[PDB]
């Protein structure tokens, strides 16, 4: 961390993954269209 | 009322309810209490109904309000509240959240409302309540309208109980060629009706029964009876009759061209002039329909048709209804060769979308009213000088200008300031940028208003503060860079004349101060000029316009002003003592904005903005410019001399009484001079250096700023504890900008001892306050006042020094934390 000491350390903030023995897993928004069930509360489309 | 939010499903019912409540409010034989109840109901409803659903009520008010009669007091308040609440729905391109964005028809109605109210109020005799109620409405509508909104249906005709009167169509005569077209269009339109019948699957039956889906008159025109042929022509007869009645020159060149065979009309598209042709023709068809409907209303003894409004008010779809028929007629005229020409009065704005922009017309009207102001101010001054006049034939003009325009101008240009300062390269607003024409008109407005108020503060009297505020707003909204780089010579001359007149007034004021003209100058410069000039210089410096605005004649005027204000240093008169703060602030802003290092004349040959560099030596002799820049005016010492004097005085420990001019004028000037020339001198980020940058025109480094800050701190310390020092806050505020370049050694050298003394004094005062508790209830009061005074002076010193300290900490906390510092720890302890 490059500025944690300058601002945040004294104010009492802990680095998010401070005591994690493994790197934090991340997810990303993949832009590959996929078929999914029509939501029951979709504001525009309804299936009967 | 709160339950009406989200009632879009029952939109028709809600709209009818609003119309009925409004009609009730506009009712006779109602007690005052009853009318108040109805008005409260209407306002409560409109405070919650969605802005889109109020379109029809706005349509009704567009007709009713402009009259500005007694029944217009409540509509005006309603519109004020509506637009103040929903300004985003109309202004922002994105619109209001969850409510959507305005429509073109709604914006057109808003513009029509604004201009109707403005025009009526212009010619309305002054009425206190009417003005007090109309001005906020105008401000709200102007703030809601987008500055660059262009009215699609813009027209210059501005022509006009609702009037259903059509033109003397049947009165005027018709050409026989137009009669032939009447027959031909009867052919085409009957065939089109039969074609629509085919689309609906209508056969040539015994009657028109829609349920039977048949037509009894479905025959080729020949069999189609002569009487029914005449009936089918009659609408065409009346249409072309009105066409002629309008003096619309119809010129036939080409010839005209059961189973429906209507000559297809869509092949050609009506031009712009033809389009507006058929729009107004549709409006007259609606006007004949309205004459019939007015006959029906007379028969019924009352009633109001929903579409009993002008075309422009009518929304597009209802417009489109009669638009189809009118354009169809005009289009068949064009095919059959009857190229009718109208000869509009609106092509003068050909293209000119800039001219159609809303802000354009608003500024044009403002400028025209500035001209009217010049006339009536000249008259008022003449009558005051001689031949007392109390009738004041321009009394209405005076009241309008001082009670509507000034608050209007103020609010409008406080709101749409970013739009007028934006440029194509850099748009610093939400969206859109003022055109060059608008930027020039705003400059003309500012210059004209300044000239109007020059030496005439008393004439306005109680409206002088409003005039000064409007000048402040316009100055803060001025785009001097664009105006000067590319603007009409008239506007550039106006701005240059403003600066020259300001310099002359300052010179006369200063010579008088060192010792009715004298009083007029004093009360004008102290009240209007100096504040406005200070604001203008601050604006120029903030937006970095100095390099482009202050050149040549403007540079000479700024030189004169600057070094006249400086020459007002030897004087010790009480008027000078009172005026020093404002003069010093003006000098600080001017030093920030001036594009020439006036304190370093030995390097002027390196300056590209200097008049000695721009104007050739053959030039500068036509004017009074001396031979060398040093002689521009010598009273001001050079930077080295000024720094030496300030340091010497601070070390000697002189007091405010012995250094009044320095503290109030020279130090504020330097605290703006050094920051500006540090960035353009050496020891500055060289991004543009590689392009063979010539040597800097200044020699300012961080050492100059560090020394100046040290001297300022020394001066404050030397004057610490004095009973009366109001200059401390001003000096701290002026010194704040130079602290970002303070060096690390400043902490121990100056800041530590100063805060140490402050802490020691605080300890002493606290000890006295403690012993006050031990003292009894009689002598404590005097002691309480004594300690109160000591704590007040201590708080003054703290509020003078701490803001400088805070900036120093902000610029060094990172380094202090990264590397532990015992000096920083000591400062924390203190």
Neighbour-count burial of B140, counting CB atoms closer than 10 A to its CB (0-12 exposed, 13-18 middle, 19+ buried): buried
Residue with tokens 């820049």: B629
Q: Please report, for residues B112, B292, B485, B678, B811, the alpha-carbon distance to residue B682 in angstroms, rounded to integers and kept in the order given.
A: 58, 84, 28, 7, 21
Q: From CA B803, how far away is CA B805, in angstroms rounded? A: 5
Minimal C-alpha gap between A38 and chain B (Å): 24
- Give the SS3 label for residue B150: strand
Cβ contact, residue pair B814, A10, below 8 Å? no
Q: Least CA distance to B815: which residue of chain A? A: A6
In chain A, residues with a C-beta closer than 8 Å to the C-beta of B819 are none
- Written as one string, the DSSP assignment of B659-725 is -HHIIIIIHHHHHHHHHHHHHHSSSS--SSTTTTPPPPS----HHHHHHHHHHHHHHHHHTTT-S--
Q: Please report, for residues B234, B412, B480, B493, B498, the alpha-carbon distance to residue B446 in angstroms, rounded to integers and kept in the order given.
A: 59, 14, 11, 13, 9
Could you give phi then psi for residue B627, rounded to 5 degrees?
-75, -40
Residue B529 DSSP class: I
Q: Which residues contact B251 (CB under 8 A, 6 or more apart)?
A: B338, B339, B340, B341
* Residue B684, token pair as written in the block: 């500055």
Minimal C-alpha gap between B808 and chain A (Å): 16
Q: Least CA distance to B812: which residue of chain A? A: A6
Residue with tokens 């159609």: B356
Q: From CA B195, how far away is CA B470, in angstroms rounded? A: 64
In chain A, residues with a C-beta closer than 8 Å to the C-beta of B820 are none
Q: From CA B671, how far away is CA B736, in angstroms rounded? A: 8
Quick check: B354 and B438 in contact, CB under 8 A? yes
Quick check: B737 and B672 in contact, CB under 8 A? yes
Minimal C-alpha gap between A5 and chain B (Å): 7
Quick check: B565 and B529 in contact, CB under 8 A? no
Count of positions (residues) in chain B: 830
Helix axes B104-123, B73-85, angle to 10 degrees: 140
Residues belonging to chain A with any Cβ–Cβ distance to chain B shorter than 8 Å: 5-6, 10
Q: From CA B8, how far away is CA B11, in angstroms rounded? A: 5
Deposited experimental method: cryo-EM
Minimal C-alpha gap between A3 and chain B (Å): 9
Cβ contact, residue pair B818, A6, below 8 Å? yes
Best of B811, B817, B828 to mutate (most A CBs within 10 Å, chain A)? B817
- Give the SS3 label for residue B203: strand
Q: Please report, for residues B511, B525, B671, the alpha-carbon distance to residue B579 in angstroms, rounded to integers and kept in the order given.
A: 14, 11, 20
User: Which of B755-765 are b and which e, b meaning 16 or more Cβ less than 10 Å from the residue's Cβ?
Assistant: bebbeebbeeb
Quick check: B491 and B443 in contact, CB under 8 A? yes
User: Which of B682-699 are b and which e, b meaning 16 or more Cβ less than 10 Å from the residue's Cβ?
Assistant: eebeeeeeeeeeeebbbb
Minimal C-alpha gap between A13 and chain B (Å): 16
In chain B, residues with a C-beta closer than 8 Å to the C-beta of A6 are 813-814, 817-818
Q: Least CA distance to A10: which residue of chain B? A: B817
Question: Which residues is B357 bridged to in the sheet?
Answer: B150
Q: Within 13 A of B679's CA, how many CA atoms are on the CB side?
A: 11
- Give the SS3 label for residue B338: strand
In chain A, residues with a C-beta closer than 8 Å to the C-beta of B818 are 5-6
- Give the SS3 label for residue B88: helix
Q: From CA B61, how far away is CA A41, in angstroms rounded? A: 41
In chain B, residues with a C-beta closer than 8 Å to the C-beta of A43 are none
Quick check: B759 and B777 in contact, CB under 8 A? no
In chain A, residues with a C-beta closer than 8 Å to the C-beta of B814 are 6
Residue with tokens 């800050």: B709
Q: Least CA distance to B814: which residue of chain A? A: A6
Cβ contact, residue pair B814, A6, below 8 Å? yes
- Written as one string, the DSSP assignment of B460-482 is HGGGHHHHHHHHHHHHHT--HHH
Minimal C-alpha gap between B20 and chain A (Å): 34
User: Which of B431-465 are b and which e, b meaning 16 or more Cβ less than 10 Å from the residue's Cβ?
Assistant: ebbbbbbbbbbbbbbbbbbbbbbebbbeebeebbe
Q: From CA B179, how far away is CA B198, in angstroms rounded? A: 28
Q: Least CA distance to A6: which residue of chain B? A: B814
Q: Please report, for residues A40, B270, B698, B787, the alpha-carbon distance to residue B77 in angstroms, rounded to integers and kept in the order given.
A: 46, 43, 59, 55
Residues belonging to chain B with any Cβ–Cβ distance to chain A shorter than 8 Å: 813-814, 817-818
Question: Which residues is B150 bridged to in the sheet?
Answer: B357
Could you give phi then psi for residue B14, rounded to 5 degrees?
-65, -45
Minimal C-alpha gap between A41 and chain B (Å): 19
Q: From CA B140, how far away is CA B16, in angstroms rounded? A: 26
Q: From CA B549, how far away is CA B523, in angstroms rounded? A: 28
Residue B516 DSSP class: -
Of the candidates B104, B102, B68, which has an alpha carbon nearest to the alpha carbon of residue B82? B102
Taking every pair of Cα atoms in chain B, the longest distance, rounded to a whole number of angstroms, is 124
Quote the distance between the C-alpha of residue B475 and its chain's center: 11
Residue B508: which H helix or E strand, with range? helix B489-514
Neighbours of B160 (CB within 10 A): 7
Best of A1, A4, A6 to mutate (most B CBs within 10 Å, chain B)? A6
Q: From CA B829, how far away is CA B614, in angstroms rounded? A: 57
Cβ contact, residue pair B818, A5, below 8 Å? yes
Neighbours of B504 (CB within 10 A): 13
Cβ contact, residue pair A5, B817, below 8 Å? yes
Interface size between A and B, measured as CB pairs under 8 A = 7
Minimal C-alpha gap between A6 and chain B (Å): 6
Quick check: B755 and B827 in contact, CB under 8 A? yes
Q: Least CA distance to A7: which residue of chain B? A: B814
Quick check: B341 and B419 in contact, CB under 8 A? no
In chain B, residues with a C-beta closer than 8 Å to the C-beta of A5 are 817-818
* Residue B735, token pair as written in the block: 């010194």
Q: From CA B635, how far away is CA B282, in angstroms rounded? A: 76
Quote the distance between the C-alpha of residue B51 and its chain's center: 24
In chain A, residues with a C-beta closer than 8 Å to the C-beta of B817 are 5-6, 10
In angstroms, the first-to-last Cα distance of chain A is 54
Torsion of CA B783, B787, B788, B794, to 10 degrees: 170
Of the candidates B776, B596, B587, which has an alpha carbon nearest to the alpha carbon of residue B677? B596
Torsion of CA B63, B67, B71, B74, to 10 degrees: 70
Q: Within 13 A of B289's CA, how many CA atoms are on the CB side?
A: 15
């Amino acid at each position: 961390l490059r500025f944690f000491a300058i601002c945040g350390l004294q104010e009492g903030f802990e680095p998010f993954a401070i005591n994690m023995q493994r790197p934090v897993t991340t997810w990303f928004s993949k832009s590959l269209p996929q078929f999914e069930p029509v939501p029951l509360e979709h504001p525009h489309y309804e299936v009967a | 009322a709160p339950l009406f939010a989200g009632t879009e499903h029952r939109a028709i019912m809600v709209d009818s309810m609003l119309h009925t409540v409004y009609r009730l409010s506009r009712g006779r034989s109602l007690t005052k209490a009853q009318r108040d109840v109805i008005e409260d109901c209407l306002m409560a409803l409109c405070r919650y109904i969605r802005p889109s659903m109020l379109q029809h009520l706005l349509r009704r008010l567009v007709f009713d309000v402009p009259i500005l009669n007694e029944f217009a007091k409540m509509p005006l308040k309603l519109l004020t509240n509506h637009y103040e609440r929903c300004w985003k729905y109309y202004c922002l391109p994105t619109g209001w959240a969850n409510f959507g964005v305005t429509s073109e028809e709604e914006l057109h109605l808003t513009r029509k409302l604004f201009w109707g109210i403005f025009d009526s109020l212009a010619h309305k005799k002054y009425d206190q309540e009417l003005y007090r109620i109309a001005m906020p409405c105008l401000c709200a509508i102007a703030g809601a309208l987008p500055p660059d909104y262009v009215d699609a249906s813009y027209s210059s005709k501005t022509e006009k109980n609702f009037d259903p009167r059509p033109v003397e169509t049947l009165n005027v005569i018709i050409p026989e060629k137009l009669d032939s077209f009447i027959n031909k269009f009867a052919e085409y339109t009957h065939e089109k009706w039969a074609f629509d019948k085919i689309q609906n699957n209508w056969s040539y039956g015994e009657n028109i029964d829609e349920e039977l889906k048949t037509h009894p008159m479905l025959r080729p025109y020949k069999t189609f009876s002569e009487k029914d042929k005449e009936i089918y022509r009659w609408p065409i007869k009346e249409s072309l009759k009105a066409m002629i009645a309008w003096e619309w020159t119809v010129e036939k060149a080409r010839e005209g061209e059961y189973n429906p065979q209507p000559p297809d009309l869509s092949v050609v598209t009506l031009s712009r002039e033809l389009q507006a042709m058929a729009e107004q023709l549709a409006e007259n068809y609606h006007n004949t329909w309205g004459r019939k409907k007015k006959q029906e209303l007379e028969a019924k003894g009352g009633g109001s048709h929903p579409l009993l409004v002008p075309y422009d008010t009518l929304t597009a779809k209802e417009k489109a209804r009669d638009r189809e028929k009118a354009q169809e007629l005009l289009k068949f005229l064009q095919m059959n060769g009857y190229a009718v020409t109208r000869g509009l009065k609106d092509m003068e704005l050909d293209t000119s979308s800039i001219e159609k922009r809303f802000a354009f017309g608003f500024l044009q009207q403002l400028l025209r009213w500035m001209d009217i102001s010049q006339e009536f101010i000249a008259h008022l001054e003449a009558v005051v000088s001689s031949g007392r006049v109390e009738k004041s034939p321009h009394e209405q003009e005076i009241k309008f200008f001082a009670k509507i325009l000034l608050p209007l101008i103020n609010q409008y240009f406080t709101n749409h300031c970013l739009y007028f300062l934006s440029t194509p390269a850099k748009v610093l607003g939400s969206g859109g940028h003022a055109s060059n024409k608008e930027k020039e008109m705003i400059t003309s407005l500012f210059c004209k208003l300044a000239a109007l108020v020059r030496h005439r503060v008393s004439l306005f009297g109680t409206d002088a503060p409003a005039v000064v505020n409007c000048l402040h707003i316009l100055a803060r909204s001025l785009d001097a860079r664009t105006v000067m780089k590319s603007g009409p010579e008239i506007v550039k001359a106006g701005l240059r004349s403003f600066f020259e007149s300001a310099s002359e007034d300052i010179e006369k004021m200063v010579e008088n101060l060192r010792l009715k003209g004298v009083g007029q100058n004093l009360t004008y410069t102290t009240v209007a000029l100096l504040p406005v000039l200070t604001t203008l210089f601050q604006h120029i410096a903030q937006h970095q316009f100095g390099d482009d605005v202050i050149l040549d004649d403007v540079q000479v005027s700024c030189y004169r002003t600057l070094c006249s204000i400086y020459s007002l240093g030897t004087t010790r008169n009480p008027y000078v003592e009172k005026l020093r703060p404002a003069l010093g602030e003006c000098l600080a802003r001017l030093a920030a904005a001036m594009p020439v290092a006036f304190l370093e004349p030995e390097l002027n040959e390196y300056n590209a903005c200097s008049v000695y560099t721009t104007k050739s030596p053959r030039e500068r002799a036509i004017l009074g410019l001396p031979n060398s820049v040093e002689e521009m005016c010598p009273d001001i010492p050079v930077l080295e001399r000024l720094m030496a004097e300030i340091g010497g005085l601070a070390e000697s420990g002189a007091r405010y009484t012995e250094m009044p001019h320095v503290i109030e004028i020279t130090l504020p000037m330097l605290c703006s001079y050094l920051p500006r020339w540090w960035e353009r001198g050496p020891e500055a980020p060289p991004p543009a250096l590689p392009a063979g940058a010539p040597p800097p025109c200044t020699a300012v480094t961080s050492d100059h700023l560090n020394s100046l800050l040290g001297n300022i701190l020394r001066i404050i310390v030397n004057n610490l504890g004095i009973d009366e020092a109001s200059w401390m806050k001003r000096l701290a505020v002026f010194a704040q900008p130079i602290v970002s370049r303070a060096r690390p050694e400043l902490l121990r050298s100056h800041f530590i001892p100063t805060i140490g003394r402050l802490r020691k004094r605080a300890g002493k005062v606290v000890a006295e306050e403690e012993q006050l508790r031990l003292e009894a209830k009689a002598e404590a009061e005097e002691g309480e006042l004594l300690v109160r005074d000591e704590f007040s002076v201590l708080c003054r010193d703290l509020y003078a020094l701490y803001p400088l300290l805070i900036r120093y900490v902000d610029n060094n906390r990172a380094h202090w934390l990264t590397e532990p510092n015992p000096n920083a720890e000591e400062l924390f302890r203190m």
